[PDB]
Symmetry: D3
């Protein structure tokens, strides 16, 4: 097989088009149920809140997994992390209701302390095998200059857990209690410098910003004076790539390209 | 010293040519004994099986270190990881005999569970100091989008262990039992997006694919319908860089360039 | 806000200039006290020794944090790591006196064994909150091909600790004993392939090299035959970017750009 | 309350009899389903095989959890640990069939490598909440001179996991996927120096030894020359305490007494 | 020295009386400031609340260190651990006010997750060196059948941290920021089966129970039906040893006897 | 087998005498080479220095393994741990020369930081398989009130490593490089409260104390004012058990009794 192509370019295009059936025209069109994985409360709204509302409005069931409790998110010396975390749980429930999300799994690892370990994979694989989602979204762990370990770890752990949820010898007590192996149909990475699929969110921008500001403990008016300009600059960065005002970007690749693929940066 | 060069380009070329005596013309020409380090059983055959057979045919002694047992490599709910691992040991012995390899060290860490720790360095440094290889091959841990931790950890651990095998205070009980410090002459990274040395394997491609399919538990006919096209697309990617049909690529750099070198990407 | 810009380029420039007040004209001009964080003894002198002497000569108080003890830095089978570490402490005190530095904190993690953990963050945050520095320098952990874990871990741990020193629930027993939260004004990364600020050190090059060779255990005459050419090639690499003979490069970015910023590579 | 007792002895008997309703007369009488936790394949049959057959014969459903795979149990340099683990799975299935057990959960931690961690608690609590056992048996981790860490860790982890299975904030994703908190009715520790309940197994001794010898890989005839004398010495040690030939001993205590109880050694 | 004694009993009494100046007559007589270490909120009041009020009433400054946040202490599926931790902080502040305590350090490790590590030692040694207490109280980690790891770990970590607070190379950045080495004068272990000093608390029993019940989230009336009988049984156990109704027991030993002392059980 | 004994006492004596061939008459009689494991420099001389000189004088080859470097053993704020470790190496070489020992392996883990892990087992098993000792001595990890983790960990790791050195799948790269499995003939635990074999050291006491005081950094004259009385009290404790002035005690048991043996405290 693949003996009749003559150049790498020819082989590459045939591998993507025919063998992997990959395209970027409307990658989320068939989704019935997606899980959006966020490192802290508010990251699904910041990274992809417009698209979450598009998906809920089409009748997609969007479920969050929040990896941490947001304990560390304050500079008030009088507000304990415990009280902050309780506050943030309510803020996310209010944000999520704005976006059409009705279920959140809280892993409750402490903010700034998310482990990178098999144990956290097992928590992700348990929920992926219970919910059988068609799609999983997570941060791109290869974003340049990303300095928060909880973000980098969430991205890697999500990609690894999507792969390992298919393997019956990984976390085998799930299979023994009736949670069968599950194969997700796509991953899409948000918070990405290398998007290849952009969603126009120009008419939902004001809703997205409302869902973000529902996390009031994080976005005081003072902080917002920097964060609205940042958020609009990011959404312009993505929307300009497809000639629209405001976009959200995602990077989608064939499953194969997450491993031993020396030309994965050609998509 | 280096006071008479006038431009960075001049200094750079003099550093590579004169000070480091680096060239890429035939980096493996003097090798008598090499170790090829693979994360799982089948990675030496996939990444570099053609070159392994070229080297064995020239009378190079090629030894494998396999970091993990391949336990997780099945979607059959009836096949335990234990039985899989035993199967894969036999598959690698058959693959390796095809390629001229006569010795495999099995570290036996469980697949998906390779640690990144001093303990695994010590296992690598023990074997490097026992065997005194001239060359070590391993995966490039900086391959973009590589999502398997066992692959990234193998690459980093191999580069670090090659450096630390030279230091008598690293794993000092080896020196005390008679395993002296050893200085390897080259590292070459396979599974790389940035190769700088390509081996033409056009006439050994069918042998390489036979050695890969000897890992029958991994490459069922169904899976092969995707993997032959992938493997030929990869070998075309490398061979086109030197104007041949099928190549294997390696990245080789002076030892110095693995540390504090801001222009290491210029080779 | 940011509703009246029309293109991403416009928004980007406004975000940097107006919102973040970022510029690279003279980033170190207001500094009274800086901490330079080095993985091993001799890295502040190698990475940035010229700039350290410029800063001390202007009356900046430069303090080092050395993360490890340099135990592993010898190929002499008769020199224990313990004796090496004591030697290197004296070498750094002599190097530092040449450069105008009068205080060194030694974390004493063993060389090749620096952890990447909350515990080491807490050591950095304790010293940052005690000393209240205006600036912190550390290695760029994203240097391509950097293969020493102690270097990569130092860079990440320094960036994370600068951020977490502002949070009263991070290492909260410091606040309880009277070490208040501290907000550093800039980070600058040395050992970088992507500098955006270069310091001309042409007239201090011979002093920098003397301060390096004060680490005599590392820079024997044999080793120096490679390291002087390397060091001059690096300083030419940086100086050529601003049209001077010898430079030291730093990468400086707005705090925001270390997190979720998809165009952080545009500066 | 407890104001009218006059002596510690009075209060102690009243606390055990009335408040905690503790007695040792027939502690396993009401059990419908028990889990027996073993460190390695064969420990349930060695520690308590007689009692397991008594309980199965009364229509108790007896389920095993085996913490490890038995990989290390051979002195044959030609038998890999993977092959040994597969052989031992089949030996335990044959042993268990003799004793009336029809379900084994295999946690598959490697022998000599069972972790002491929250992750292994979570595996135990998942199975306890799925199966809702009335009783759990495990090794007494306070056996004097017990030198195998897998045995000590299994006993402590089993005691902790029975307590933490009742707490909805412990392993909270189990509650989210519908595995509710479960409160076990008794724990009984086998392999104990301080039994307080002894089961007469005199007429099932030969069956117990048959069930042990079904683990042929561990009990070769040479090894059996020491192990039959040992096993009969242990069962006499227990049986003599109740005036019977062969006994199996267990230590049972009120749940309160596993915590902050300074007179727990009085039962 | 010690050449003129003839029997072990003679040498032992001379070592305790003369060399170590040990006696149990009034071990807390000279204390001006003590730290009481508790695993969870409420353990100081349960283990030693009477004695705490005696010491505060004599003008001793009593300070708590609480190792964990009490997150796991509920069976209510609607009460998150974050909300429980906030509630328990307020309960301990009310309990502590009843007992005369005016300062609590919260280490905030999560309940059931206290680590056993150098990092937690460092937290203890930082507070011991800041506060310079004369005495430290902690749970006896050798209590038989103690099954809660947070309790065992707190006792061992407290004993080790009191020893290591005197060593300037342990946590050496404390010395560098001006927290000098401190030598505590006594340790006393509560929650002990082997007390050698008992405090009569008969007239403070009702106050002790009030201070316990201030932790309302833990001591609902249902739970109290078992806990008052337990607590009065324990205080009778101690009080009967000195001929009083209700006592709190402590184990005090010379510092030497916590290490390599084969007759430490003779006191 | 063991069907004709009638009582537990009968079976027990037959198991010890006949099956296990255990006796305590002269347990060290046949030894040609022993390894004495110490946590810190000076523990072999303190725990068993008399017996070490008796064995060297009979032509036994006595080898030390020291687990840690003694870094933390000073209260001088001017003496770094690195300098202390170098000083203690020389002190142990002088102590060892007095006692007839000619070989010390230094594992160089930092004092107060010895890990409890498979990695440290592997270091012990490498040396045991290289040297093939007949006997191994180590601290009894069950000494009551022992509060130094390096001591507890050394005892447990030494017992486990002697067992696991016989297993070819444990640390299997040793077998691959030609270090075969080794079966030690006896273990003896020193620093024990439960000795069952006592060596009369009355005429070597002064030499033992000289060998201890050779660790001058630990035994200043001030400290010696407490330590000579302690050491003579301990040696009287042991010697009185066999009717001699000064003794060193050891606990020896059949290998079987370190595992699942409920009457191991009867010897
Ligand atoms: Ca490319
Ligand atoms: Ca470049
Ligand atoms: Ca860019
Ligand atoms: Ca008792
Ligand atoms: Ca005693
Ligand atoms: Ca006994
Ligand atoms: Cl085909
Ligand atoms: Cl085909
Ligand atoms: Cl990370
Ligand atoms: Cl405004
Ligand atoms: Cl020169
Ligand atoms: Cl020259
Ligand atoms: Cl990784
Ligand atoms: Cl086909
Ligand atoms: Cl505004
Ligand atoms: Cl505005
Ligand atoms: Cl790293
Ligand atoms: Cl020269
Ligand atoms: Cl009542
Ligand atoms: Cl009542
Ligand atoms: Cl253990
Ligand atoms: Cl026979
Ligand atoms: Cl005297
Ligand atoms: Cl004297
Ligand atoms: Cl514990
Ligand atoms: Cl009542
Ligand atoms: Cl026989
Ligand atoms: Cl027989
Ligand atoms: Cl320990
Ligand atoms: Cl004197």
């Amino acid at each position: 097989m693949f003996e009749n192509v003559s150049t790498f370019e020819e082989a590459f295009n045939k591998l993507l088009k025919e063998v992997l059936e990959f395209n970027l025209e409307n990658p989320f069109e068939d989704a019935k149920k997606v899980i959006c994985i966020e490192p802290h409360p508010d990251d699904c709204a910041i990274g992809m809140g417009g698209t979450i509302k598009k998906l809920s409005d089409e009748g997609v069931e969007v479920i969050y997994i929040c990896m941490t409790d947001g304990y560390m998110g304050t500079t008030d010396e009088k507000l304990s992390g415990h009280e902050l975390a309780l506050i943030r749980r309510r803020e996310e429930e209010e944000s999520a209701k704005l976006l059409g999300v009705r279920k959140i799994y809280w892993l409750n690892y402490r903010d700034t302390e998310l482990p990178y370990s098999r144990e956290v994979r097992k928590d992700l694989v348990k929920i992926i095998r219970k919910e059988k989602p068609d799609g999983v979204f997570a941060p791109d762990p290869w974003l340049p200059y990303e300095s928060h370990p909880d973000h980098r770890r969430t991205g890697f752990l999500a990609i690894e857990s999507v792969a390992f949820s298919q393997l019956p010898n990984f976390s085998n007590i799930d299979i023994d209690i009736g949670l069968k192996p599950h194969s997700v149909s796509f991953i899409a990475l948000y918070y990405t410098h290398k998007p290849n699929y952009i969603v126009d969110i120009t008419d939902l921008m004001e809703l997205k910003l409302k869902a973000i500001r529902a996390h009031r403990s994080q976005f005081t008016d003072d902080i917002w004076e920097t964060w609205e300009p940042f958020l609009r600059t990011v959404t312009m960065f993505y929307g300009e790539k497809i000639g629209v005002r405001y976009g959200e970007g995602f990077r989608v690749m064939p499953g194969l390209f997450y491993h031993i693929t020396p030309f994965a940066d050609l998509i």
